[PDB]
A = this chain, B = another copy of it.
Amino acid sequence: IQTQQLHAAMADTFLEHMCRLDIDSAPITARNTGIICTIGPASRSVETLKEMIKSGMNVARMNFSHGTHEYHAETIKNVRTATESFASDPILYRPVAVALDTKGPEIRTGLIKGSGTAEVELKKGATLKITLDNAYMEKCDENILWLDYKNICKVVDVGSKVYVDDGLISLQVKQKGPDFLVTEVENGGFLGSKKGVNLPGAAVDLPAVSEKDIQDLKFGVEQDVDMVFASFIRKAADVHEVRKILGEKGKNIKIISKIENHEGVRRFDEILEASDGIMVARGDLGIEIPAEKVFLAQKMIIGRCNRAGKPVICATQMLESMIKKPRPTRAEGSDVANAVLDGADCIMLSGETAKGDYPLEAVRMQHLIAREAEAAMFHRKLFEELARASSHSTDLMEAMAMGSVEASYKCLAAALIVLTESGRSAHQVARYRPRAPIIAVTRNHQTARQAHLYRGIFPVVCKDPVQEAWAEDVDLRVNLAMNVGKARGFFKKGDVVIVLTGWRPGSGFTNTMRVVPVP
């Protein structure tokens, strides 16, 4: 039996491709889909983070809708301490990116019983009072719930629904007062701290960038984060404001715009143009729009990102049941697989790693599913259709990238080795979707961390001095990639790899492609 679904790869039609998928065709060792993990109470110790990294985490997401600056600064330091504990073996060291996820124009509840991790059970049919009175900001419980949108009474009426925590709990407004709402719990569930609140259709008036957003973005720059996940982006102008806040000092921080309401979907094209990448933020998106339409938004957005070559993240509830169970549901296995098949560069865990009982198992499960689904992609058709979509561009690096991926298909190469400093050369390869892993070797450590945003880029940090002869410096870096792929089991001596390098030090892209045997 051909490994890597290579019998399905040769199919002529999509139907035949599907009919050839074979549970006994082994996937390869390399896993191309980036894994992004929300770090919080369950996952922020140095010891757990070491195991997260070993289980496959590539990006640590800090959610600034929770915690304080000091809380997230300590989480981040632990991420970097854990990451650097593997630096004593540069062949095995994995770069780990740090992402800051913004509050944005959102509504949040307060602290249950003065704690960011406390919860209470709401009973169906019980009464629950919402108050605006800051005396209760840190004193929420099963009777009294505070939230931070001072104008809420002007946008809801008796009979309105108030949804808490991505639609988990629905509250029906029964009475209104000057700074309170008396509601009835329409369905039971557990209410925790600082939960999002959605009032779908209602005219919530909040700025693209709040004063708290400005302080969090500035903290991101101070902390040297690699990327910002900008919540509730609704138009290109919002991205521009975020980029302005990040300023000259933060000019290389990637802005990933989160699509999570109707307007972000309807203005998607201008948002993508202005952003460095996209998150399909299904948590909010699936209570802001009809839940049966989210999959339409997801495949549209992933496809248009693939077309532009810009990273796209699929997020939220992918393995939700694993918050409490050590194995996922069948719908959850299917969801991760299909997001990889849709074309997502990265997949993400939220509660599964931030607060659940099985954070390592959730990471490990995303790793296993992603590898299976990567082999089950229909690469030959995908490449043809991406090439068609980009054909107005005659860009030279795109040409090198398409030529290299094409060669990698024909000779079934075990990897593409790319030498890159800004990352661009490796990004353009990733965009044309080889099945083999892309080992990107860079002396730019931030380039290495940000590469996790792209399907199939396995970044490697070169810490050696720059050799006097350009040809020897190229070889030193190619040989580093060679030793990494051997150590990771991506290939062995005598396999064939594609190697992308710059011809001269002054080439500003990898204009040189070789097929070489592994030494």
Contact = CB atoms under 8 A, between A and B. Distances in A.
A474 B317 CA distance: 52
A329 B303 contact: no
B406 A292 contact: no
A37 interface: no
B333 A295 contact: yes
Interface stretch (A62-70, A203-211, A386-394, A437-445): A386-394
Interface string A325-342: 111111111111111001
A517 to B, nearest CB: 9
A191 to B, nearest CB: 14
Nearest to A342: B18
A407 interface: yes
A451 interface: no
A463 interface: no
Contact of A295 (B326, B372, B411): B372
A4 interface: no
Contacts of A331: 317-320, 329, 331-332, 334-336
Interface string A374-407: 0010000110111111010011101110111011
Contacts of A22: 296, 300
B15 A385 contact: yes
A14 interface: yes
Q: Which of A297, A317, A318, A413 has the most CB of B within 10 A?
A: A317
Interface string A346-387: 000000000000000000010011011100100001101111
A515 B168 contact: no
Interface stretch (A89-97, A237-245, A282-290): A282-290
Contacts of A368: 290, 292
A468 interface: no
A372 to B, nearest CB: 5
A168 B5 CA distance: 30
Contacts of A20: 300
Given A15-B303, A307-B19, A411-B396, A333 B292 contact: yes
Given A303-B18, A320-B331, A403 B394 contact: no
A231 interface: no
A299 B188 CA distance: 36
Contacts of A410: 387, 391, 394-395, 398-399, 402-403
A467 interface: no
Interface stretch (A77-85, A218-226, A506-514): A506-514
Given A407-B403, A411-B394, A329 B337 contact: no
A266 B24 contact: yes
A30 interface: no
Interface of A: 5, 10, 12-16, 18-24, 167-168, 170, 186-189, 262, 265-266, 282-283, 286-287, 289-300, 302-304, 306-307, 316-321, 324-339, 342, 365, 368-369, 371-373, 376, 381-382, 384-389, 391, 394-396, 398-400, 402-404, 406-408, 410-413, 496, 503, 511-516
Q: 4 closest A-B pairs (Cβ-Cβ)?
A: A331-B335, A403-B407, A403-B403, A18-B303
